[PDB]
């Protein structure tokens, strides 16, 4: 509304409540703190849209049981289709990780002490303060004397003092408590591990068997890595979405070809901020969100967004700012990892991301955003593109309560979301996978129609539209006499009709 | 357009890029001796005329009834092909509170020379009303001595001759010529700064407006409007029988500019009547008033006409001056909905060349509009509304830009749906399909509306009817060269018959 | 101040007086109506800044006398250095003109009649309704059956029906009265003539001898044409400004290379509107003005701006609009031709351009114009460029009465003018030619300091700044207590303007 | 800032593009046990500390006098080389109307575990002020029972523990534990929504402020400012002797946000004190208040500080969390003049790494600012004035962008000329040359200002005095790597000594 971004900031009002709808999807990592069906039901009620399974840990049998619990909780609400919320399942691959071994349970590494790194498997369960095993058998080929090795989210740091043929002698730079099977980072080293290992192949086939909705591919460095994951999913998994995790320097450098090959991007800030200087992570995050926004592809901001809530019921002020600014940047989804997998306050963490995301969406400077997105998108002969941007423009003109989109594949609703309306996008589908995957796109509130198909086209259209009207009324997005925008076809790939209709 | 700044947009204008076929700006032609025959009117229509203006400053009711007959005979000679038929509107331009001189005396030369520094007596004695000459001039404003004083300036004939009042009398004035010149018969007089007390709607005006209602004219151009109550009185004369006739207030004096907002609110549209305006206010200020008025009409979504002397030299020459070509283009760049020809078509030697030149310039200028900025500004200065038709309109225009559509096709009964699209100034032509002949004629007032009159019978099933009128628009656009099979067009329709229900926008390929 | 151009337009107010200063230069063509010392004096008082001498007509002896009269009229005001106005002298070359012979007097040409065009010089003084001689001797090699030939301001038009050896048989398409020695246009034909004829070389050498300030080079088609003009003016004329007249299709197509080679541009709309379709001239006009504004080179809009005032004391409404829109477009100068060379109301024509230009300058949307000029202009290590744009920003911030610029060559003042401040740019120089050429630049009000040079540089700066203070007070540009911007150097000579000061008017 | 849109500007951010040497955002470090020794303060200064914050919520006048002495000793250890000397400001942060609990009892564990649903009695009986435990909790707000009601929430220890009042008494409250946790001694208590009637300026605060004046502090961070009259009270206490001390109002409750405008008018600057603010208002609204206040301070040209938990994890860890890296960067991108460290430097294990991290992030964020849009908007929202100083400042900032200058050099007495430059947010560092030590330290409050203290005697020739100080600035910039010989800088000077005469801008090559 204000004519400048500065005036817009000056008018932000803490006493102005936001609208009901929350447009940014929330991705929760499942683990011991959130694995029970009972807790999952509350997670869903608190706002979880996507359950993420971290395949860096756990057996297939452990993950099959998590998936089972997630679906039990999700389907416990299916008896009321107007209130049912689809919940997607994401498989986050291990990828080319480096891990330490088992502590012979922690030991205290002291700054200045010597610590020897061994590849001898006779020590893989006998790590202590003098000797440390790790599973990267080629480490001696890629690090030099003077190299830095980081352990456990980059908190422990070691300096290589001597390099043998199959061992390293290091000095502890930043010490502290060292546990078992901790992650290792070698920034600057040309780590030669494969993008898709044999474990990754087994995990990906398991995801197809288990009917997952998306894959979060760790440590993607180039387009050929994405093509490899895509080849493994094969024809049977061809509709599974591949989200490439950017988390090293090469992935940032090669981001454009990775984006073109991917269905979406995760800014995987944990590893990313150890691989590049921490003071540069915000630049990469904003670069990648902007480029994904410009391309109309989903982008996830992830890792440590509410980290202190693993142990505290309230977040720090930096965490509140970080969630809000991710939404203001343009992130389609935000994510929780330890805060929901292992923390003491998993439901409070979900509710806080819901609350902050909703406040941040109300603070977006839509006047400039809508202008620049349209200026940066080319002209096209696609009738669905023109109808989508026309519908969004109409939605700003009448401050509609929603844009209702009927969609089989999701494509129609994605095209609308790319132009970032303020109003929620109620995407009506009969395809359950479409409904689960639509959570990746900002603004899309998927609803799963279960009424049988009508033989007459016009009748089946009116049925799904009335379904959306009832969902919107039930959720409090709008009320009788409000005005909504409705996008339909006139005959998949034929969305070309916009109607401005009052809610009955 | 596409450059990120207006300055770069200017730098990229290319005389070698042809414009599109469609011409969006309406052309209003004043009919007179040079254009009155059915034959010539047929060529005027072919050349681009959209509205025939009848100037009631001259002519009897018999005379104007015959002009209207000939306009309609020429217009309906094209009706046998509904695809190519062009509606032609009829406009009545009132005389209003004009001041005119008398006739030059029989003896002597046809015109008298008023020489700088000479004395000239102005009389109201009717014994001189047909014996005007270089010593004594009669005029028909019987109260003129009451509203002028010594030192007052009096202008005669398009402001070209100027007098200064040296002595005031009971029923005369003694003046000194300042700007001399040749004086003919029955010339217009202006008293800038004087409080002229003639009514906005005279007894003659009432009879003319009542005549216009009976003859079924489409619009009235109301001369010398100074305030909203002037407009209301015109509206009251037109009454219930003429309630659908559009009132265009002519702004031609300082008070009309001063009270412009209330006049615009009461009016259906505005004419910037630059002839009288440039005499009532300093000539160097007219462009300011023009740009202010076009801007405010654009903001309000009401039609605005730029009028008078746009191609003046073409009264005697077959090509216009460079100033005239620039004037026509800048009126369109300003945002005028219509442009107008007066003497160029009513009396000049090249009426068809004048119409053709306005059609050519307007089309080039429309291609030069910086739509990127204009569309953004119109949206920002337009309020949010709970009106579904308004949301649909702006949504259709945005979609029209996104796919570079060949047209926006709008089914409309009253015209309103199409006018709401026109207010947002799409590049593409707006084909307004109506079965209402008056709607089709009045639609010429709005930039970009190309009205087509469907004469097919109403199909029993609404959906079938709609598709009939859409396909009619498709045939018209293909025939006029606006688009071809496989192009994308925008189509706006209602959800039920009647006015007020336009809520549906479709992006469809042309068959 | 409005946030949108649309709202800016809506707020234009006919009752708001403009400031006193008029920033757009007025160029007047001198001719029979305006040649006398007595009239030239009134032309200067009415606002004429540049006297244009059209070398399509007249002998060197005739033009030498014109120049003497201009300088007599101009120096008649030198008595008072604070009110003295410099007046430049412009030579407008004949160029590759095509002219008909002598009728030997006018004939009528009827539509549909036959007219024969001959190169036979026996008929050169025997033009009539049947036979017409023109001086372009290769015309048959460039025209084709069916081509259009335009005579006399494009008002008569002929279509070639038969093409011979030294002959053309035409049909009269647009008739009318035909006098002697009228101009011919062959739009679409690839005319062969030199851009610099031998007569042009003698005329340019004459201009150097007469100390003219600028050359208006007719029918410039390419950069090498401009190079050839520069070569002829030579070392002796190296400071004469060369303005290329764009008036054919080739000049528009090759505008960029011509602008780069030129000191400035004239949009010569008369010939241009016959060479290209009349409805396209406004596009060429705004293109060239925009490109000249972007390059920071002067651009003149010319021809038929107030044409009806050749015979009438007031202009038409389209002529009022044309002058104003030229200024709104961004033209640095506007020009009068027949209106002052030969018409009945030369002083009224000048006064009207002065009045319209001032009203138009007050209506410019400076908020957007200053934003876009900066965006399009490069980052530079040149200190005077940075100082100039800093001075313009400062002038907008404090709504200053003027920007005062001391300049030897003009360049420092030209750099300010490119950023288009609202405030007048008082350019103080001791170089009289600098003072005359500065009229080419929108906003520059040049003043000629005649005081001797003070031994102390610092005192000589203050003296020249105090001179501008007195000029601005006398002309009513500002009053004591107003704030102005002052631009100066740090050491004497050209190329050191790096100092901006905000100071009260004493 | 070169892309035509903010979105493309984002798309072009390049992690491999190194930033300029200069860091423009001031860093304020809270001093405490971790950072109080002279040896550590010297390393704090080298790491980037610009302002030392003394937290008067804790410690005696003796303690704070010694802190001030050590800060001055470390700062003046660099004074031998005036080219490299960095001024360091001293800030006094008042206790204000704090509410705190008592000491945990000596018996049992050091902290007591409060369990969800347990009963906890709050008492005002002083016999318990050092005997708090899991059943009884003393606090020091003797009027608490008069401002809370049954149902009210009471928060303890950074809002981490929450209690609901279930029963009221004359000197006690019975509460139920809502959010349990480990309770230590002398923790902060918040009563959001309650009408706490503690004075803005207690007698203790008055003694602290008077001690601040006597110890020559540079600025005061006034806690819990709710209204302009609170600010006027601080200013009156500082009095004539303290009239040059800058008052920074800390906004940390709902009423201070509500009355922000009148507070900002009365204050020299603002601190967004997010610690208490995020307990007094919902945590999810803090970012809205932060961005509003930063925007309104930027619009007003007054310094704004973003404070609290910016690098909180670094109290215990040598690297920050990803959210902490993003928070610091976004504070700078919002427009914060300074950023602050609290426990990170006052008591943490990694004070030097925390300072260095803020310096590294702020420098990267400053290179990412979209100056193209920022400079346009700051100019559009700023008034036209006859103030010649203000016109000179915006002109130098425009010139700095035009030639990509290495610095803007500003000679200033009071600092104001350099403040006026900083308000328009140049990319180039502002080297503010002053002989007033207090001006130099206070200049750290303003984004972009690099203060340097000239220790040369005044030259009798004004022109020679200017030149001496400008060349000092040249040598500073070369030593610090802000520019080299042949680079171009902007120089602002006045036309006579004293404040208010800045009116000269020069573009000069670096000698
Ligand atoms: O030569 C000229 O000035 C013209 O043709 O307009
Ligand atoms: O006082 C403070 O600094 C706070 O509460 O954030
Ligand atoms: K993983
Ligand atoms: K010439
Ligand atoms: Mg009139
Ligand atoms: Mg010419």
Which segments of D325-472 are extended strands (E)? 338-341, 408-411, 430-434, 449-453
Q: Does C293 lie at the interface with D, CB-CB under 8 angstroms?
A: no
Q: Encoding tokens for residue A14?
A: 């803490």
Q: Say which DSSP state C212 is in.
A: -
Residues D321 and D346 in one domain: yes
Q: Does D314 lie at the interface with A, CB-CB under 8 angstroms?
A: no
Reply yes or no on whether B166 is catalytic: no
Given C312, C339, C362, the domain boundary residue is C362
Q: Encoding tokens for residue A75?
A: 């389907």
- Three-state SS at B189: strand
Residues B379 and B498 in one domain: yes
Residues C266 and C283 in one domain: yes
Distance from C-alpha of A418 to C-alpha of C117, rounded to nearest angstrom? 68
Number of neighbours of residue A296 by Cβ within 10 angstroms: 15
Instruction: Tell me which residue has its CA closest to atom 1 in ligand 2.
Output: D273
CA D435 remoteness from chain centre: 24
Distance from C-alpha of C333 to C-alpha of C326, rounded to nearest angstrom? 9
Backbone dihedral angles phi then psi of residue D146, each to the nearest 5 degrees: -85, -15
Residues B209 and B297 in one domain: yes
Contacts of B204 (CB under 8 A, 6+ apart): B95
Q: D15, A280 in Cβ contact below 8 A?
A: yes
Mutate-to-test residue for ligand 2 from D97, D223, D257, highest number of ligand atoms within 8 A of CB: D223
Distance from C-alpha of D165 to C-alpha of D120, rounded to nearest angstrom? 9
Q: C102, C124 in Cβ contact below 8 A?
A: yes
Distance from C-alpha of A496 to C-alpha of A488, rounded to nearest angstrom? 6
Query: Is D58 known to sit in a ligand binding site?
Result: yes
Name the strands in the sheet holding B488-494, side by side, starting at the edge strand that comes first in the sequence.
A444-448, A425-429, A403-406, A483-489, A495-502, B502-509, B488-494, B408-411, B430-434, B449-453
Residues A136 and A268 in one domain: no
Whether residue A111 lies inside any domain: the answer is: yes
CB spacing of C317 vs B310 below 8 angstroms: yes
What residues 357-386 of chain A have any CB closer than 8 A to a CB of chain B?
Answer: 371, 374-375, 379-386
Query: Is B250 known to sit in a ligand binding site?
Result: yes
Q: Does D323 lie at the interface with A, CB-CB under 8 angstroms?
A: yes
Residue B491: closest CA among B474, B479, B478, B476: B474
Distance from C-alpha of B419 to C-alpha of B443, rounded to nearest angstrom? 8
Q: D260, D251 in Cβ contact below 8 A?
A: yes
Distance from C-alpha of A10 to C-alpha of D158, rounded to nearest angstrom? 28
Q: Which chain D residue shows the shortest CA-CA distance from C489?
A: D506
Whether residue B5 lies inside any domain: the answer is: no
CA A140 remoteness from chain centre: 34
Cα end-to-end span (Å), chain C: 29
Quick one: which ligand is closest to A99's CA? 3
Distance from C-alpha of D506 to C-alpha of C488, rounded to nearest angstrom? 10
Instruction: Tell me which residue has its CA closest to atom 1 in ligand 1.
Output: C268
Cα end-to-end span (Å), chain B: 28
Cα end-to-end span (Å), chain D: 29
Residues C356 and C380 in one domain: no
Length of chain D equals: 511
Q: A191, A221 in Cβ contact below 8 A?
A: no
Residues B356 and B377 in one domain: no
State if residue C303 touches ligand 1 by the CB under 6 angstroms criterion: yes
> Which whole-number Å values give the CA distances from B338 to B24, B257, B442, in the listed order?
9, 19, 12
Backbone dihedral angles phi then psi of residue C138, each to the nearest 5 degrees: -105, 20
Q: Encoding tokens for residue D113?
A: 């575990």
Measure in Å the smallest separation between the Cα of B72 and chain A Cα atoms: 39
Q: Which of A5, A278, A306 sits opposite D377 (nearest CB)?
A: A5
Whether residue C102 lies inside any domain: the answer is: no
Determine how β-strand A444-448 pairs with β-strand A425-429. Answer: parallel
Whether residue C100 lies inside any domain: the answer is: no
Contacts of D457 (CB under 8 A, 6+ apart): none
> Which whole-number Å values give the CA distances from B407 to A383, B84, B422, B444, in the listed order?
14, 17, 12, 16
Number of neighbours of residue C452 by Cβ within 10 angstroms: 9
Residues D167 and D259 in one domain: no
Q: B27, B359 in Cβ contact below 8 A?
A: yes
For D25-88, the DSSP string reads SEEEEE-STTT-SHHHHHHHHHHT--EEEEETTS--HHHHHHHHHHHHHHHHTTTT-TTT----
Residue D387 with chain C: CB contacts under 8 Å: 398
Q: C504, D399 in Cβ contact below 8 A?
A: no
Half-sphere exposure of D43 (CA within 13 A, CB side): 13
What atom in ligand 2 is closest to the CA of residue D340?
A: 3
CATH number, residue D413: 3.40.1380.20
Q: Which helix (H) or strand (E) holds D270?
A: strand D269-273
Identify the bridge partners of residue B493 per DSSP, sorted by sequence position.
B504
Identify the bridge partners of residue A177 per DSSP, sorted by sequence position.
A108
Distance from C-alpha of B342 to C-alpha of B276, rounded to nearest angstrom? 13
Q: Which helix (H) or strand (E) holds D345?
A: helix D343-346
Identify the bridge partners of residue C205 per DSSP, sorted by sequence position.
none
Place of tokens 């705190």: D100
Identify the bridge partners of residue B177 per DSSP, sorted by sequence position.
B163
Residue B505 with chain A: CB contacts under 8 Å: 387, 390, 394, 497-499
> Which whole-number Å values give the CA distances from D250 to A203, D276, D405, in the listed order?
53, 10, 35
Residues B186 and B208 in one domain: no
Instruction: Report how far ligand 1's centroid is from the alpha carbon of B15 (Å).
Output: 19
Contacts of B69 (CB under 8 A, 6+ apart): none
The residues placing their C-beta within 5 Å of ligand 4, an ion, are C 54, 56, 92, 218
- Residue D496, Ramachandran bin (φ over 0: left; ψ between -120 and 50: alpha; else beta): beta
Identify the bridge partners of residue A246 per DSSP, sorted by sequence position.
A267
Q: Encoding tokens for residue B319?
A: 């090509």
Distance from C-alpha of D237 to C-alpha of D251, rounded to nearest angstrom? 20
Distance from C-alpha of D151 to C-alpha of D124, rounded to nearest angstrom? 19
Number of neighbours of residue A72 by Cβ within 10 angstroms: 12
CB-count burial class (<10 Å; 0-12, 13-18, 19+) for D202: middle
Q: Say which DSSP state D118 is in.
A: -
Backbone dihedral angles phi then psi of residue C378, each to the nearest 5 degrees: -70, 155
Measure in Å the smallest separation between the Cα of B506 and chain A Cα atoms: 5
Contacts of A365 (CB under 8 A, 6+ apart): A5, A8
- Three-state SS at C26: strand
Distance from C-alpha of C400 to C-alpha of B190, rounded to nearest angstrom? 40
Active-site residue among B23, B25, B30, B53? B53
Contacts of C341 (CB under 8 A, 6+ apart): C29, C30, C31, C32, C33, C34, C54
Contacts of D101 (CB under 8 A, 6+ apart): D132, D137, D138, D139, D140, D156, D183, D185, D186, D187, D189
CB spacing of B396 vs A382 below 8 angstroms: no
Whether residue B18 lies inside any domain: the answer is: no
Identify the bridge partners of residue A252 per DSSP, sorted by sequence position.
none
Residues A90 and A119 in one domain: no
For C148-171, the DSSP string reads EEEETTTTEEEEEEEE-SSEEEEE
Q: B409, B400 in Cβ contact below 8 A?
A: no
Active-site residue among C148, C245, C436, C475? C245
Contacts of B99 (CB under 8 A, 6+ apart): B139, B140, B141, B144, B188, B189, B190, B191, B196, B198
CB-count burial class (<10 Å; 0-12, 13-18, 19+) for A108: exposed
Rounded to 10 degrees, what is the CA torsion of D155, D161, D166, D168? -50
Q: Encoding tokens for residue B252?
A: 């031609």
Which residue out of D461, D490, D507, D508 would a mutagenesis test of the C interface target, given it has the greatest number of C Cβ atoms within 10 Å? D507
Whether residue C141 lies inside any domain: the answer is: yes
Q: Can you give the residue range of the structural domain that contains B223?
A: 23-96+201-366
Q: Which helix (H) or strand (E) holds D306?
A: strand D304-307
Q: Say which DSSP state C139 is in.
A: G
Resolution (A): 1.9
Residue C371 with chain D: CB contacts under 8 Å: 376
- Three-state SS at B478: helix
CB-count burial class (<10 Å; 0-12, 13-18, 19+) for A56: middle
Residue C292: closest CA among C373, C383, C390, C388: C373
For D205-244, the DSSP string reads HHHHHHHHHHTT-SEEEETT--SHHHHHHHHHHHTTTTTT
Q: D325, A273 in Cβ contact below 8 A?
A: yes
Given A361, A385, A418, the domain boundary residue is A361
Length of chain A equals: 504
> Which whole-number Å values give the CA distances from C166 to C119, C172, C184, in the listed order?
5, 19, 17
Residues A87 and A114 in one domain: no
Distance from C-alpha of D496 to C-alpha of C306, rounded to nearest angstrom? 53
- Residue C6, Ramachandran bin (φ over 0: left; ψ between -120 and 50: alpha; else beta): alpha
Length of chain C equals: 506
Determine how β-strand A156-163 pairs with β-strand A148-151. Answer: antiparallel
For A413-480, the DSSP string reads HHHHHTT--SS-EEEEES-HHHHHHGGGSTTEEEEE--SPPPSSHHHHHHHHHHHHHHHHHHHTS--T
Give, in degrees to the nearest 5, the angle at Cα D466 between D460 and D468. Answer: 85
What residues 336-355 of chain C have any CB closer than 8 A to a CB of chain B?
Answer: 352, 355
Which residue out of C390, C395, C457, C461 would a mutagenesis test of the D interface target, given it has the greatest number of D Cβ atoms within 10 Å? C390
Q: Which of A396, A496, A500 sits opposite B507 (nearest CB)?
A: A496
Contacts of A232 (CB under 8 A, 6+ apart): A196, A200, A201, A204, A205
Q: D155, D162 in Cβ contact below 8 A?
A: yes
Q: C462, C61 in Cβ contact below 8 A?
A: no
Q: D89, D50 in Cβ contact below 8 A?
A: yes
Q: Which helix (H) or strand (E) holds C462?
A: helix C457-475
Distance from C-alpha of C441 to C-alpha of C421, rounded to nearest angstrom? 12
Greatest CA separation found in chain B?
78
Whether residue B427 lies inside any domain: the answer is: yes
Residue B398 with chain A: CB contacts under 8 Å: 389-390, 393-394
Q: Encoding tokens for residue D232?
A: 């006027």
Instruction: Report how far ligand 2's centroid is from the alpha carbon of D307 (Å).
Output: 7
Q: A37, A69 in Cβ contact below 8 A?
A: yes
Distance from C-alpha of D274 to C-alpha of D276, rounded to nearest angstrom? 6
Q: Encoding tokens for residue C425?
A: 């740019």
Distance from C-alpha of A413 to C-alpha of A417, rounded to nearest angstrom? 6
Determine how β-strand A25-29 pairs with β-strand A333-336. Answer: parallel
Instruction: Report how far ligand 4's centroid is from the alpha carbon of D140 (Å).
Output: 96
Q: Say which DSSP state C125 is in.
A: G
> Which whole-number Å values give the CA distances from C416 to C20, C263, C364, C410, in the listed order?
20, 17, 17, 10
Q: Which helix (H) or strand (E) holds D138?
A: strand D136-138
Q: B121, B136 in Cβ contact below 8 A?
A: yes
Determine how β-strand D26-30 pairs with β-strand D51-55. Answer: parallel
Length of chain B equals: 511
Determine how β-strand A176-178 pairs with β-strand A167-174. Answer: unpaired
CB spacing of B505 vs A490 below 8 angstroms: no
Distance from C-alpha of B318 to C-alpha of C155, rounded to nearest angstrom? 7
**What is chain C's Cα-based Rg?**
24
Given A331, A361, A391, the domain boundary residue is A361
Greatest CA separation found in chain A?
78
Whether residue D73 lies inside any domain: the answer is: yes
The dihedral built from the CA positions of residue B311, B312, B313 and B316, taken in this order, carries a sign that is positive
Count of the separate structural domains present in chain C: 3
List the determination method.
Answer: X-ray
> Which whole-number Å values give the CA distances from A70 to A29, A38, A64, A445, in the listed order?
12, 10, 10, 19
The dihedral built from the CA positions of residue B406, B411, B415 and B417, taken in this order, carries a sign that is negative
Residue B410: closest CA among B391, B429, B382: B429
Measure in Å the smallest separation between the Cα of B469 and chain A Cα atoms: 17
Residue A397 with chain B: CB contacts under 8 Å: 379, 384-385, 390-391, 394-395
CATH number, residue A309: 3.20.20.60
Distance from C-alpha of B41 to C-alpha of B52, rounded to nearest angstrom? 9
Residues D438 and D485 in one domain: yes
What totals of helices (H) and strands (E) does chain D contain, helices first?
18, 21
Q: Which helix (H) or strand (E) holds C51?
A: strand C50-54
Give, in degrees to the nearest 5, the angle at Cα D105 between D99 and D111. Answer: 75
Give, in degrees to the nearest 5, the angle at Cα D507 between D506 and D511. Answer: 110
């Amino acid at each position: 509304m204000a004519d400048t971004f500065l005036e817009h900031m000056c008018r932000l009002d803490i006493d102005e409540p936001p609208i009901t709808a929350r447009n940014t999807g929330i991705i929760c990592t499942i683990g011991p703190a959130s694995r029970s069906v009972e807790t999952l039901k509350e997670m869903i009620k608190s706002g979880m849209n996507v359950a993420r399974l971290n395949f860096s840990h756990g057996t297939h049998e452990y993950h099959a049981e998590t998936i089972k619990n997630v679906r039990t909780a999700t389907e416990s609400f299916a008896s009321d289709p107007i209130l049912y919320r689809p919940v997607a399942v994401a498989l986050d691959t291990k990828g080319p990780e480096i891990r330490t071994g088992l502590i012979k349970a922690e030991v205290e590494l002291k700054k200045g002490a010597t610590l020897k790194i061994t590849l001898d498997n006779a020590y893989m369960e006998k790590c202590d303060e003098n000797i440390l095993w790790l599973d990267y058998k080629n480490i001696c080929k890629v690090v030099e004397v003077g190299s830095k090795i980081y352990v456990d989210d980059g908190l422990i740091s070691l300096q290589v003092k001597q390099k043998g043929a199959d061992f390293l002698v290091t000095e502890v730079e930043n010490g502290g408590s060292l546990g078992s099977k901790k992650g290792v980072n070698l920034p600057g080293a040309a780590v030669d591990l494969p993008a898709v290992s044999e474990k990754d192949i087994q995990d990906l086939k398991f995801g197809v068997e288990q009917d997952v909705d998306m894959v979060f591919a760790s440590f993607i460095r180039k387009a050929s890595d994405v093509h490899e994951v895509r080849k493994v999913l094969g024809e049977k998994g061809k509709n599974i979405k591949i989200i490439s995790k950017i988390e090293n320097h090469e992935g940032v450098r090669r981001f454009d070809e990775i984006l073109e090959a991917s269905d979406g991007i995760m800014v995987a800030r944990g590893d990313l901020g150890i691989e590049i200087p921490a003071e540069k992570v915000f630049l990469a995050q904003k670069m990648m969100i902007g480029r994904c926004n410009r391309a109309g592809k989903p982008v996830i901001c992830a890792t440590q967004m509410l980290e202190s809530m693993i142990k505290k019921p309230r977040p720090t002020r930096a965490e509140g700012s970080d969630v809000a600014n991710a939404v203001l940047d343009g992130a389609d989804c935000i994510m929780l990892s330890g805060e929901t997998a292992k923390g003491d306050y998993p439901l409070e963490a979900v509710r806080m991301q819901h609350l902050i995301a909703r406040e941040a969406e109300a603070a977006i400077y839509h006047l400039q955003l809508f202008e620049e997105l349209r200026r940066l998108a080319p002209i096209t002969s696609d009738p669905t593109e023109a109808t989508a941007v026309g519908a969004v423009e109409a939605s700003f003109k009448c401050c509609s309560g929603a844009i209702i989109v009927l969609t089989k594949s999701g494509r129609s609703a994605h095209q609308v979301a790319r132009y970032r309306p303020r109003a929620p996008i109620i995407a009506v589908t009969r395809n359950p996978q479409t409904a689960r995957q639509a959570h990746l796109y900002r603004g899309i509130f998927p609803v799963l129609c279960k009424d049988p198909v009508q033989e007459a086209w016009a009748e089946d259209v009116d049925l799904r539209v009335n379904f959306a009207m009832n969902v919107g009324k039930a959720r409090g997005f709008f009320k009788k006499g409000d005005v909504v925008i409705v996008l339909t076809g006139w005959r998949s790939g034929f969305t070309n009709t916009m109607r401005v209709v009052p809610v009955p």
